[PDB]
């Protein structure tokens, strides 16, 4: 019960305990026998030199490293039972050993965070008040007709959700880079298959037209050679499938969006889903300001252990998109992902404290409605409800999202919400 | 069935295989899905970018490292099923990558050796012919009476198998080293608890006598500071238990040798055991000359893989003796154990081919006799026979020893054996 263990830094802990002679040669000597038997390797020790005598005679000679072996044995045994699976090899960071002085070492394992909330009354929440006007309706109607163009060739009627066969070459400052080498490539526009700006700039151009587009790329880009670099892309565009002139074709109701729908059904389903995405837009718009305000108002120390964990996870997420790759994602630069990781860690901590202090729960009842609304986007909602509920991972992931809004709403009720009417331009600020 | 794989060095192998476009995007794409499902992580990939498209679009960009990941995945999956356990981290030794040329890498796993026999007719076996004379009997009887001294004090009647309390300090050339620091230490002489010569040199001295002893240490010693160093050891020797003057004490029949025995029983059992050790002495004497002759006559390339394996095992054997330690034995110098390891590897290879060519077997019947002879040194041979046979490890290890003599005897029947009479001094050559 009475033991002495210290802490170094991070998850590192320091042991090196001094015990009495009667304690040493009794407990330690016997303990070794027990561990040997546990692995059933006790019978493998042919002892010219009896263990009791040898450990007593040369015990002091390598007693330091004996402790090291024990430390090693406990560490491996502990990780297996705690279900901690380290990939590759952990880095053991020891200090310089001084002969005569004490020694300090790392050894990483368990974690434990603590948070506090301040500046809550300073949280000003902006709620934009918007509505649909005639101009919006007319614009929507005008756009819908412009999407009506069936199978035919030449000219140029590029759709914002169709297949465009693009022949292009990656040229930035008049120089060609490693990427940008593609042939007979079919790009689906509107799905976010390219860097923002690039797939949108195609709109308005004709097939067989050379124009070039101005793309600057994000500052936070995985490829340093292209980060914040203005690329031009010549775009020769030779053939392309194209679709001009509206006639009778039955594919615009079964090749667009999700599943296949009727003339009125497609409009209805698109209308609800468009408004559904509006929920995301408004919610994110509100969330970003709230988060930004808290970070600026309250600058606090951030645990590196949490950051490292998130960075490593982010690398997997990015690699998944990069090419569905893993493992090699480890070699990706830390700083490129650490900047956003800091934000994610802080957000989680802030939300978590709200959850702890108010004792929030993942409400299954609220989740029920969310699942049912999603299920209503399919031919049969009943099978979807069963499908979703028969998979723990889907339920759990949904609950995480549901909890996110619950945590925010709890904060909102405790904060200063101001409702202001605004223009559509302000809601277009979804760049970040 | 038609594949191309090359070899590099050691256990290293080179893959890097070129395939047609149809083969690539078909088999590789589908294989990834199968492996994902095997780990049941396929449902975790929320794909903004479809796998079929991303792996094609950016497939060539990181295709090299994709192969690397696959290589990584195959390696770990293979070792688990092959029951290969690597302790620590395997060093992946790659070469320098040239942009435009081919690449060569290691990656170690499976082994496969081959041997040939030559100079068999040149094997000259020395068989010493010796016999017991009256002088041997007189000397034996003389020695036996000299061991007859019972409990008492002072003077000095040190036995070559009793407990001696020695107070000593480790001093080599007038300098004290890290070791040699022991107090109240009870040393059992005759059992080989010390460096050959040190414990023997005690014989003849008196309790409370300062004399110093010349100990040179082996050239092949684990401690570099003491390897081939002449140590003196001052030896003060203050108390000691001692045993002088022969009276009636019942402990010389139950505190000597193995188990307890009667007056005639002890002599009889000692007599057979002494002759038993003679078998070992003669066998080793014959073996050493035979092995040494073969090595000098046939110098062949030795596979490093086998040597590395033996060295690591030797370090365990040495560490077991050092303090019953493992793991840290890894840090022990390679060159200090590699020299004897080379010999052990060569001997094993030579013996192995004898076994392969003549198709030798581990003769259970011969083993039965050996077990019975060992069992005949106990109070009840029957329980020992059951004891031994109910333990696979004991049986197997015994068979290894039995096989050793069988292999040697097979060689002897093919080699030139010459029987020569010799003196007892030549048989004392057991230093190596």
UniProtKB/Swiss-Prot annotation, chains A, B:
<dbReference type="InterPro" id="IPR046357">
    <property type="entry name" value="PPIase_dom_sf"/>
</dbReference>
<dbReference type="GO" id="GO:0043335">
    <property type="term" value="P:protein unfolding"/>
</dbReference>
<dbReference type="GO" id="GO:1990169">
    <property type="term" value="P:stress response to copper ion"/>
</dbReference>
<dbReference type="InterPro" id="IPR008881">
    <property type="entry name" value="Trigger_fac_ribosome-bd_bac"/>
</dbReference>
<dbReference type="InterPro" id="IPR037041">
    <property type="entry name" value="Trigger_fac_C_sf"/>
</dbReference>
<protein>
    <recommendedName>
        <fullName>Trigger factor</fullName>
        <ecNumber>5.2.1.8</ecNumber>
    </recommendedName>
</protein>
<comment type="function">
    <text>Involved in protein export. Acts as a chaperone by maintaining the newly synthesized secretory and non-secretory proteins in an open conformation. Binds to 3 regions of unfolded substrate PhoA, preferring aromatic and hydrophobic residues, keeping it stretched out and unable to form aggregates. Binds to nascent polypeptide chains via ribosomal protein L23. Functions as a peptidyl-prolyl cis-trans isomerase in vitro, this activity is dispensible in vivo for chaperone activity.</text>
</comment>
<dbReference type="InterPro" id="IPR036611">
    <property type="entry name" value="Trigger_fac_ribosome-bd_sf"/>
</dbReference>
<dbReference type="GO" id="GO:0015031">
    <property type="term" value="P:protein transport"/>
</dbReference>
<dbReference type="GO" id="GO:0042802">
    <property type="term" value="F:identical protein binding"/>
</dbReference>
<dbReference type="GO" id="GO:0043022">
    <property type="term" value="F:ribosome binding"/>
</dbReference>
<keyword id="KW-0143">Chaperone</keyword>
<feature type="region of interest" description="Dispensable for chaperone activity, although its removal significantly decreases antiaggregation activity">
    <location>
        <begin position="148"/>
        <end position="251"/>
    </location>
</feature>
<keyword id="KW-0013">ADP-ribosylation</keyword>
<dbReference type="Pfam" id="PF05697">
    <property type="entry name" value="Trigger_N"/>
</dbReference>
<dbReference type="InterPro" id="IPR001179">
    <property type="entry name" value="PPIase_FKBP_dom"/>
</dbReference>
<dbReference type="Pfam" id="PF05698">
    <property type="entry name" value="Trigger_C"/>
</dbReference>
<keyword id="KW-0413">Isomerase</keyword>
<feature type="region of interest" description="Ribosome-binding">
    <location>
        <begin position="1"/>
        <end position="112"/>
    </location>
</feature>
<keyword id="KW-0131">Cell cycle</keyword>
<dbReference type="GO" id="GO:0051301">
    <property type="term" value="P:cell division"/>
</dbReference>
<dbReference type="GO" id="GO:0044183">
    <property type="term" value="F:protein folding chaperone"/>
</dbReference>
<comment type="subunit">
    <text>Homodimer and monomer. In vivo most of the ribosomes are in complex with monomeric TF; binding as a dimer has also been suggested. Uncomplexed TF is in a monomer-dimer equilibrium with approximately two thirds of TF existing in a dimeric state; binding to substrate PhoA induces monomerization, 3 TF monomers bind somewhat independently to a single substrate molecule. TF and SRP can simultaneously bind to ribosomes; TF binding is abolished when SRP is bound to FtsY in the presence of a non-hydrolyzable GTP analog. Contacts ribosomal proteins L23 and L29.</text>
</comment>
<dbReference type="GO" id="GO:0005829">
    <property type="term" value="C:cytosol"/>
</dbReference>
<dbReference type="InterPro" id="IPR005215">
    <property type="entry name" value="Trig_fac"/>
</dbReference>
<keyword id="KW-0697">Rotamase</keyword>
<dbReference type="InterPro" id="IPR027304">
    <property type="entry name" value="Trigger_fact/SurA_dom_sf"/>
</dbReference>
<dbReference type="GO" id="GO:0061077">
    <property type="term" value="P:chaperone-mediated protein folding"/>
</dbReference>
<dbReference type="Pfam" id="PF00254">
    <property type="entry name" value="FKBP_C"/>
</dbReference>
<keyword id="KW-0132">Cell division</keyword>
<keyword id="KW-0963">Cytoplasm</keyword>
<dbReference type="GO" id="GO:0016020">
    <property type="term" value="C:membrane"/>
</dbReference>
<feature type="modified residue" description="ADP-ribosylarginine">
    <location>
        <position position="45"/>
    </location>
</feature>
<comment type="similarity">
    <text>Belongs to the FKBP-type PPIase family. Tig subfamily.</text>
</comment>
<dbReference type="GO" id="GO:0051083">
    <property type="term" value="P:'de novo' cotranslational protein folding"/>
</dbReference>
<dbReference type="GO" id="GO:0003755">
    <property type="term" value="F:peptidyl-prolyl cis-trans isomerase activity"/>
</dbReference>
<dbReference type="InterPro" id="IPR008880">
    <property type="entry name" value="Trigger_fac_C"/>
</dbReference>
<dbReference type="GO" id="GO:0009408">
    <property type="term" value="P:response to heat"/>
</dbReference>
<feature type="domain" description="PPIase FKBP-type">
    <location>
        <begin position="161"/>
        <end position="246"/>
    </location>
</feature>
């Amino acid at each position: 019960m009475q033991v002495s263990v210290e802490t170094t830094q991070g998850l590192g802990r320091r042991v090196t305990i001094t015990i009495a002679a009667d304690s040493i040669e009794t407990a330690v000597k016997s303990e070794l026998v027990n561990v040997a038997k546990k692995v059933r390797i006790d019978g493998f020790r042919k002892g010219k030199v009896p263990m009791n005598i040898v450990a007593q005679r040369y015990g002091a000679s390598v007693r330091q490293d004996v402790l090291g072996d024990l430390m090693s044995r406990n560490f491996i045994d502990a990780i297996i039972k705690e279900k901690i699976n380290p990939a590759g090899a952990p880095t053991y960071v020891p200090g310089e050993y001084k002969l005569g002085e004490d020694f300090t070492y790392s050894v990483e394992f368990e974690v434990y965070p603590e948070v506090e909330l301040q500046g809550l009354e300073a949280i000003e929440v902006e709620k934009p008040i918007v509505e649909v006007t005639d101009a919006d309706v007319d614009g929507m109607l005008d756009t819908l007709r412009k999407q009506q163009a069936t199978w035919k060739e030449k000219d140029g009627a590029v759709e914002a959700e169709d297949r465009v066969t693009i022949d292009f070459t990656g040229s930035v400052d008049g120089e060609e880079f490693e990427g940008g080498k593609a042939s007979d490539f079919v790009l689906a526009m509107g799905q976010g298959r390219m860097i923002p700006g690039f797939e949108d700039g195609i709109k308005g151009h004709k097939a067989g037209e050379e124009f070039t587009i101005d793309v600057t790329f994000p500052e936070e880009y995985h490829a340093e050679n292209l980060k914040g670099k203005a690329a031009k892309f010549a775009i020769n565009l030779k053939k392309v499938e194209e679709r001009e002139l509206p006639e009778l074709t039955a594919e615009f109701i079964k090749r667009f969006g999700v599943e296949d729908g009727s003339v009125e059904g497609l409009r209805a389903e698109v209308r609800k889903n468009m408004e559904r995405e509006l929920k995301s837009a408004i919610r994110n718009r509100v969330k970003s300001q709230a988060i930004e305000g808290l970070v600026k108002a309250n600058d606090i120390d951030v645990p590196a252990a949490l950051i490292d964990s998130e960075i490593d996870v982010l690398r997997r997420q990015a690699a998944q998109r990069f090419g569905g790759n893993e493992k090699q994602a480890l070699e990706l630069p830390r700083e490129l992902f650490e900047e956003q990781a800091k934000r994610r860690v802080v957000v989680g901590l802030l939300l978590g404290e709200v959850i702890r202090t108010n004792e929030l729960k993942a409400d299954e009842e609220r989740v029920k409605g969310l699942i049912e609304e999603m299920a209503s986007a399919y031919e049969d909602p009943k099978e979807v409800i069963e499908f979703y509920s028969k998979n723990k991972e889907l339920m759990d992931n949904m609950r995480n999202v549901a909890l996110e809004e619950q945590a925010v709403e709890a904060v909102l009720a405790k904060a200063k919400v101001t409702e202001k009417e605004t223009t559509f331009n302000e809601l277009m600020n979804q760049q970040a």
